[PDB]
């Protein structure tokens, strides 16, 4: 019954991305002083099952001046890596016990930009031709802001597995000994996964969001779908790394209860940022990576190399 | 003879501009930060050092067998 476990994880998470689109706007609504979806629910709660069927009735045109084998291959690789990344992730037991899987996250988070380079090219012209080229350019630069300060906690964890990442935090809630790194951990995933203040991928008044701009609601229904699957997955990855919960072997039930409550709270922030702050005007977006984000990340890197040595506090492995 | 303006009852409301509430600034910050961070590393070396002791016990049970 291994095969019944995989389907027990793909299916209960497509609701949690469909019942986030509803909480996308109720939370964003009471900031504006207005109620949620009022009339169809009764409370709203039945909105996404009606708002899903309309997309698969509405005619999925392909553009006449488009290519063929590239345009319908990027949504295959969209939902592939958006759902494959949920595998090696402990809660409290992961589906797969990888020896080194923290690196496997970057082995999965690297190839997502290789679909945007397809879809911006595969269909058509300037509102997604050059307008998606400068969306690959922001997402590549926020790995070296990411991969360094992901390594900067592993000097204190001890190894590459994720079971040690819960063992080392039984008494600490490790956001305290590394709170400068925890800041730039947030803004990276806030800009890499293409969200509200550092936007130009989706597109406000930029490429009039020319990375979708062309998908009718047949193939478009996943892009949004798949994408919303990253944003609840960097939140499930931050809360297993910094704000780690407590594991008890005799009681694994109380792990998940105290766990899903925490990833939901960080997921609120991606909604709660959007209702405050304006955009970044593509220069100043990348003007603060090199000049401003990056030299501090090397500074704490050299700090976290020497401090396990000159404390005589080497983590065991 | 039924016309508006009252004989009295007025404010007015201000034209002013003020909300400068401070705020715990100016060497109060950078002092709670370092004082919190050094409590973190002090909470290290009591766990990472202690886990290093149980680590050797885990290798110990290996070596006492395997002849
Ligand atoms: C459009 C449809 C057509 C395309 C359909 C196919 C699409 C497939 C794309 C999937 C890409 C995922 C590739 C990821 C490779 C990384 C896998 C990995 O590293 O697993 C971790 C583990 C490492 O070993 P370890 O951790 O030490 O095991 C514990 C031992 N105590 O390793 C293991 O546990 C076992 C290692 C051997 C397992 C078999 C080999 C894994 C790769 C098989 C697929 C080959 C890749 C196909 C090409 C990819 C294209 C993107
Ligand atoms: C000797 C002992 C050792 C000493 C250790 C001391 C530790 C010190 C730790 C310091 C390092 C951590 C702080 C990180 C640096 C902050 C990033 C930065 O430098 O931003 C600079 C940015 C540039 O703009 P600026 O310079 O202000 O010029 C324009 C003025 N007209 O100006 C900005 O402010 C930009 C602000 C961020 C831009 C994105 C804002 C979007 C919203 C993000 C909200 C995030 C909220 C928190 C994240 C979640 C936290 C859990």
From Swiss-Prot, chain A:
Principal place of residence: mitochondrion
Any one annotated GO CC term: respiratory chain complex I
Statement: the UniProt record of this protein carries the keyword S-adenosyl-L-methionine: no
Biological process annotations from GO: aerobic respiration; mitochondrial respiratory chain complex I assembly
Membrane topology: Multi-pass membrane protein
Residues that span the membrane, as ranges: 2-22, 70-90, 100-120, 146-166, 172-192, 222-242, 253-273, 294-314
Record's keyword terms, sorted: Electron transport, Formylation, Membrane, Mitochondrion, Mitochondrion inner membrane, NAD, Respiratory chain, Translocase, Transmembrane, Transmembrane helix, Transport, Ubiquinone
Superkingdom, natural source: Eukaryota
GO molecular function: NADH dehydrogenase (ubiquinone) activity
Enzyme class: translocase
The family this protein is said to belong to: Belongs to the complex I subunit 1 family.
PANTHER family associated with the record: NADH DEHYDROGENASE SUBUNIT 1, NADH-UBIQUINONE OXIDOREDUCTASE CHAIN 1
Record's subunit section: Core subunit of respiratory chain NADH dehydrogenase (Complex I) which is composed of 45 different subunits.
HAMAP family hit by this protein: NDH1_NuoH
Descriptive protein name: NADH-ubiquinone oxidoreductase chain 1
Source organism of this protein record: Bos taurus (Bovine)
UniProtKB/Swiss-Prot annotation, chain B:
Localization terms from the record: Mitochondrion inner membrane; Nucleus
Top-level taxonomic group: Eukaryota
Transmembrane region(s): 24-45
Family the entry assigns: Belongs to the complex I NDUFA13 subunit family.
Subunit architecture: Complex I is composed of 45 different subunits. Interacts with CARD15, but not with CARD4. Interacts with STAT3, but not with STAT1, STAT2 and STAT5A. Interacts with OLFM4.
Function: Accessory subunit of the mitochondrial membrane respiratory chain NADH dehydrogenase (Complex I), that is believed not to be involved in catalysis. Complex I functions in the transfer of electrons from NADH to the respiratory chain. The immediate electron acceptor for the enzyme is believed to be ubiquinone. Involved in the interferon/all-trans-retinoic acid (IFN/RA) induced cell death. This apoptotic activity is inhibited by interaction with viral IRF1. Prevents the transactivation of STAT3 target genes.
Name under which the protein is recorded: NADH dehydrogenase [ubiquinone] 1 alpha subcomplex subunit 13
Organism: Bos taurus (Bovine)
Gene: NDUFA13
Part of the whole protein covered: 7 to 73 of 144
């Amino acid at each position: 019954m291994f095969m019944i476990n995989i389907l027990m994880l793909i299916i209960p998470i497509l609701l949690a991305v469909a019942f986030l689109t509803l909480v996308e706007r109720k939370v964003l609504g009471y900031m504006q002083l207005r109620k949620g979806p009022n009339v169809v629910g009764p409370y709203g709660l039945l909105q996404p099952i009606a708002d899903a069927i309309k997309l698969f009735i509405k005619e999925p045109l392909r553009p006449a001046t488009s290519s063929a084998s590239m345009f319908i291959l990027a949504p295959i690789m969209a939902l592939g890596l958006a759902l494959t990344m949920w595998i090696p992730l402990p809660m409290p037991y992961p589906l797969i016990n990888m020896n080194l899987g923290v690196l496997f996250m970057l082995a999965m988070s690297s190839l997502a930009v290789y679909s945007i380079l397809w879809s911006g090219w595969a269909s058509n012209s300037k509102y997604a031709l050059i307008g998606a080229l400068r969306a690959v350019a922001q997402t590549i630069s926020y790995e070296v802001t990411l991969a360094i300060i992901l390594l900067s906690v592993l000097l204190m964890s001890g190894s590459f597995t994720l079971s040690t990442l819960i063992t080392t935090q039984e008494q600490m809630w490790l956001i305290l000994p590394a709170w400068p790194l925890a800041m730039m951990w947030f803004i990276s995933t806030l800009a890499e996964t293409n969200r509200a203040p550092f936007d130009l991928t989706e597109g406000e008044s930029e490429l009039v969001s020319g990375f979708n701009v062309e998908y009718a609601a047949g193939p478009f229904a996943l892009f949004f779908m798949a994408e919303y699957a990253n944003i609840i997955m960097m939140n499930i990855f931050t809360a297993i790394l910094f704000l780690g919960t407590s594991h008890n072997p005799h009681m694994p039930e109380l792990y998940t209860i105290n766990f899903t409550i925490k990833s939901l709270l960080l997921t609120m922030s991606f909604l709660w940022i959007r209702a405050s702050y304006p955009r970044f005007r593509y220069d100043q977006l990348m003007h603060l990576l090199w000049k401003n984000f990056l030299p501090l990340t090397l500074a704490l890197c050299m700090w976290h190399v020497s401090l396990p040595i000159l404390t005589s506090g080497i983590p065991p492995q | 003879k039924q016309d508006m303006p009252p004989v009295g009852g007025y404010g007015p409301i201000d034209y002013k501009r003020n909300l400068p509430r401070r705020g715990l600034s100016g060497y109060s910050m950078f002092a709670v930060g370092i004082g919190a961070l050094l409590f973190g590393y002090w909470s290290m070396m009591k766990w990472n050092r202690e886990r290093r002791r149980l680590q050797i016990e885990d290798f110990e049970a290996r070596i006492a067998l395997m002849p």
